[PDB]
Every structure is written in C-alpha cells, then in structure tokens.
C-alpha cells in the first residue's frame, strides 16, 4: 500500500502534487484487475489542473509515501519491480501509447528488490527526462508487489500480483526532439496471466530467475535511479 506524494526536478520539491499534478487515487489499495481501465493511471483517472514543466535532460524524481510523508513508504513484504513509462497527454492513456523509460527488479550484487531499495530511498527513484517533442505527457510510475502473485487474481480475486500505480502531468518545455517518441503497449493489455514476471513464487523461487514483464526500456531512455535526492524533512 503505497501512493505519490510529489515530485522533484532536479533535485528541487515541487511540492505536495495529489489531485495537483498527480491523478491521484482516493486511497493506496492495489490495483489487481490486469483486464481493468483501473490499469491505466489506477481509479480516478482525470485531467487534474498543473502539469509540471521540466527540460529534456532534467532529473524528474517520483517520492512514494505509504501513509504520511517520508514514513516507512511501503511494508517490506512488498518485494517486487518498478518501471516508468510515458505517454502523450492527448492519448489520455488510451491505445498502443506507452513507452518503458525504466525497469528495476531485483540487483544480484546487493541482494535486493527495487522496493527494499526504494525504502532506503526515502520512497525516491528518478529518470532522465527524454529528448522528446515538447508538449504534454503523462509519467506512469508502477510498482508491482509480488508477495501473493504465486496465484492469478484471474483465477484467484483473494490473492494475486498488487500494481501501484500513478500517473503524473508532465509538461516538456525545452527539448532538441532528438529521439521523437515511438509508439507504445496499451494499459490495461501489455500484461496478461501468461506475460512473465505476473505469475511468481519469491518464497521458493531465487529472485535471480525473476524477468520483469515486457516492453523492454526503449532505446532512447537515459536511464535513472533508486536513490533519495532531496530531504523532505527540511521543509
Ligand atoms: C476485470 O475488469 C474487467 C473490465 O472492467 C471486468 O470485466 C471483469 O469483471 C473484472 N474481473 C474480475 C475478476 O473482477
Ligand atoms: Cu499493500
């Protein structure tokens, strides 16, 4: 159980986002409905009023929070990946529009998930802003948590693979449009109950056999972290 607070750009807090800048849900329960319009940018999806301007090349930082700010983020139990994806605005989400910037699931050198590094991070992972079109685009950040996802919620609605999801307006102001933004896999419908990484056991298979569900991060990203990059607490 985990939603987003805000975000910062390039190392600067641009201040409590919810029902702002982020379409925010009402509450952090999971989604679990693979074949749901919740899958998109989760259950109240609307145009909120800001959109936050950044530059190609800026450090755009997602901070996750699980009840209050800068709290315990999310419960240790929730192993599992986080991705990043963008769309256009003017799509709303909808069709083949979404392109993976990021993909972190579990790290072989430190024996952790994305999740057990986002805690430490203060709820804190970050992404390159792409050489795109200037214009309007939605962030979606997603984390999976897999602690019940040896079942299919398909087969089994008491257990299953948690999405988090939020969706932040992001408004691209300066851009050289170097890489100019291909097409994407629509939400819901790029995961389904035979798409890799939906279905695992952690509890008795080793995490260095984990694949994170397809797309692969398109080849014009330029990468990001799992790592704190502003204090909360100094404000
Ligand atoms: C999943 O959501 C879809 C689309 O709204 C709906 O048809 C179906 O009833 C849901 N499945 C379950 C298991 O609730
Ligand atoms: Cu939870």
């Not at 800026?58 to 929730?78: G, K, V």
């Not at 952790?112 to 200037?134: C, E, K, Y």
Request: charged letters at 15%; glycine letters at 8%; a negative charge.
């Amino acid at each position: 159980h985990t939603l987003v607070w805000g975000v910062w750009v390039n190392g600067v807090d641009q201040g409590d986002g919810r029902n702002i800048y982020i379409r925010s849900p009402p509450n952090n329960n999971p989604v679990k409905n693979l074949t749901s319009p919740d899958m998109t940018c989760n259950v109240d999806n609307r145009v909120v009023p800001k959109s936050v301007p950044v530059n190609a090349g800026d450090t755009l930082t997602f901070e996750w929070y699980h009840n209050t700010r800068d709290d315990d983020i999310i419960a240790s139990s929730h192993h599992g990946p986080i991705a990043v994806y963008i769309a256009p605005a003017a799509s709303n989400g909808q069709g083949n529009v979404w392109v993976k910037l990021f993909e972190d699931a579990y790290n072989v050198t430190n024996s952790t998930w994305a999740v057990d590094r986002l805690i430490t991070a203060h709820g804190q992972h970050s992404v390159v802003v792409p050489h795109v079109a200037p214009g309007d685009y939605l962030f979606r950040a997603e984390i999976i948590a897999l602690h019940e996802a040896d079942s299919l919620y398909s087969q089994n609605p008491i257990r299953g693979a948690q999405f988090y999801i939020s969706c932040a307006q992001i408004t691209i102001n300066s851009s050289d449009d170097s890489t100019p933004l291909p097409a994407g896999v629509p939400f819901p419908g790029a995961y389904t109950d035979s798409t890799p990484g939906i279905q695992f056991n952690i509890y008795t298979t080793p995490a260095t056999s984990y694949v994170a569900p397809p797309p692969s991060v398109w080849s014009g990203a330029l990468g990001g972290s799992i790592a704190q990059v502003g204090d909360a607490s100094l404000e």
